Point group: none
Chain length 73, copies 12
Amino acid sequence: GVVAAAEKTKQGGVLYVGSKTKEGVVHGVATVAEKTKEQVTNVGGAVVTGVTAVAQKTVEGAGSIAAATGFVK
Amino acid sequence: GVVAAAEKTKQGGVLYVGSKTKEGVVHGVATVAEKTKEQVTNVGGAVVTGVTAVAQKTVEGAGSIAAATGFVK
Amino acid sequence: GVVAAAEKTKQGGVLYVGSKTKEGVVHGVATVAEKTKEQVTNVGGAVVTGVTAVAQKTVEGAGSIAAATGFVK
Amino acid sequence: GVVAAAEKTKQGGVLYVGSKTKEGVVHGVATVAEKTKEQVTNVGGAVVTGVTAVAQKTVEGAGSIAAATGFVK
Amino acid sequence: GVVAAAEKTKQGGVLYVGSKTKEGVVHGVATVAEKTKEQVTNVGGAVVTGVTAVAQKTVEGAGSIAAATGFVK
Amino acid sequence: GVVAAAEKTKQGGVLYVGSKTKEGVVHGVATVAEKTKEQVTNVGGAVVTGVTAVAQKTVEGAGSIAAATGFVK
Amino acid sequence: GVVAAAEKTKQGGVLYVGSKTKEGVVHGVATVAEKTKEQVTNVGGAVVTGVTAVAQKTVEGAGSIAAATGFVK
Amino acid sequence: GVVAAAEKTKQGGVLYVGSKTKEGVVHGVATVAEKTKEQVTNVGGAVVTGVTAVAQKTVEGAGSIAAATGFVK
Amino acid sequence: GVVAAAEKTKQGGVLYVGSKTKEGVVHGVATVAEKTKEQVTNVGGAVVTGVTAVAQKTVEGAGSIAAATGFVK
Amino acid sequence: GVVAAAEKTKQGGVLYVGSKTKEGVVHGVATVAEKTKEQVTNVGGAVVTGVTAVAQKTVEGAGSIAAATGFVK
Amino acid sequence: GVVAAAEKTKQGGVLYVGSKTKEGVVHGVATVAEKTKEQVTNVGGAVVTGVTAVAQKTVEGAGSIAAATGFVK
Amino acid sequence: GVVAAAEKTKQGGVLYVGSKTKEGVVHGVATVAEKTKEQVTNVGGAVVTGVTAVAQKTVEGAGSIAAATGFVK
């Protein structure tokens, strides 16, 4: 029994990034496996991958994740 | 039994990014596997992948993910 | 039994990106597998993939994902 | 038993992107597999793939995804 | 029995980053395994991976994660 | 029985980073294993990985993680 | 007084080149100048310019070059 | 007074090159100048310029170059 | 008074090169100058410029160069 | 008075090179100057410039160079 | 008075080089000067410049160089 | 009065080099000067410059160099 819920209610900066680079290799949420059974990936928020990665005010409300795996019984 | 719910109710910046690069290789939510049974990917939020990746005020309301996997019984 | 629901109710910036690059290779939500049974991909939010990837105010209401996989019994 | 629902009710920016590049290869939601049984892809939100990918105010209401896979019994 | 909940209610900076680099290799949430059974990755907050990674005011409300794995009985 | 909850309610800087480098290799939350059973990764907060990694005012509200693993009985 | 002379009298190999490349820029006998008076180029032999440049038994007889420049008196 | 002469009289190999490269920039006999008077280039032999440059038995007879420059008197 | 002469008279190998590279910049007989009077370049022999440069049995007979420059008197 | 002469008379190997590299910058006979009068370059022999530079049995006969410069009187 | 002469008369190896490198910068016969009068470069022999530089049996006969510079009188 | 002469008359090895390196900077016959009058460079023999520099049986006959500089009188 997997349940989830969320509720958001609303009754209503000179950021500078300078990047100079060469030969960038970036892996973000790599999951490397061999001879498994189950692989689960739940993303309820920001995943910002780059060579330049800027996030501003991104994840600002009511997140919920519910996971259940296996249960051989 | 997998249930989910969400509710959003509304009763109603000189950001600068400069990027100079060469030869960019970016993997974001890579999931590499061999000889599995089940692979699940739930994205309820931002996945921003790039060489330049900018996210502003992205995920701002009422997210919900419910996953159940396996259950051999 | 897989159920989901969502409800949104409404009773109603000098962002600059400069990119100079060469030879960009970007993989976003790659899922590489071999000899599996089941592969599920649910996208209820933003997936922004690029060499330049800009997201502004993207995912701002009432998301819901419900997944169930397997159940051999 | 797979059910879903959604309800949206409404009782009613000098963004700049400059891109200069060469030889861009971009894969967005690639799912590579071999010798499987089932492959499911549900997109209820934005999938923005490019060399330049800009998303503004995209996914702003009442999303719902319900998936069930397998069930050998 | 896996349950989760979250509630957010609202009744309502000269940051400078200069980066000069060469040959950057970055792995963020790598999980390398062999001959397993189960792999679970729940992201309810920020995962910012880059060569330059800037996060400002990112995760500012009502996060909840509930996970259960195994249960051979 | 795994439960979680969170509630956020709101009734309402000349930072400088200069980086010059060469050949940066960064691993953030690497988890390397062999011949396991279960691998769980719950991220409810910031994971900022880079060669330059700046976080400002990131995780400022109502986090909750509940995990249960094993239970052979 | 510029004189030249030449006389040739005749009283009568598993070479392998493999080249694999990308983005080749080759300048051979470039002579870049500004605000000059005189520019002389005498070629009495081989000038072999390429990305792959193979010369075999090329310049095998009786070369002569005589040059005189200037002489303001 | 510039004189030259040459006389050739004739009274009559598993070489392997393997090249794999990327982004080759080659300048051979570059002569860069500014605000000069005289520029002389005499080539009586091999000039082999390339990314792969192979010369075999090239310059095998009777070369002669005679140059005189200036002589303001 | 510039004179030259040459005379050639004739009364009549498992070389292996393997090159694997990336980003090669090669300058051979560069002569960089500013505010000069005279520039002379006499080539009576091999000039082999490349990323891979192989010369075999190249300059095998009777070379002669005679140069005179200046002579303001 | 500049004279030269040469005379050649003829009365008639498992070399292995393996190169693996990256980012090669090679200058061979660079002559950098500013505010000069005279620049002379006489090449009567081998000039082999490369990232891989192999010369075998190259300069095997009768070389002669005669140069005179200046002579203001 | 500059004279030169040469005479060659003819009355008629498991060398292994293995190189593995990265970021090679090589200057061979660099001559850097400022505010001069005269610059002379006579090459009558081998100049082998590289990252890998192999010379075998190169300069084996009858070399002669005669230079005279200055002579203000 | 500058004279030179040379005469060559002919009346007729498991060498192993293994190099593994990183970041090599090599200057061979550098001549750095400022506010001079005369610069002379005579090469009648081998100049082998590299990161790996192998010379075998190179300079084996009849070399001669004669230089005269200055002579203000």
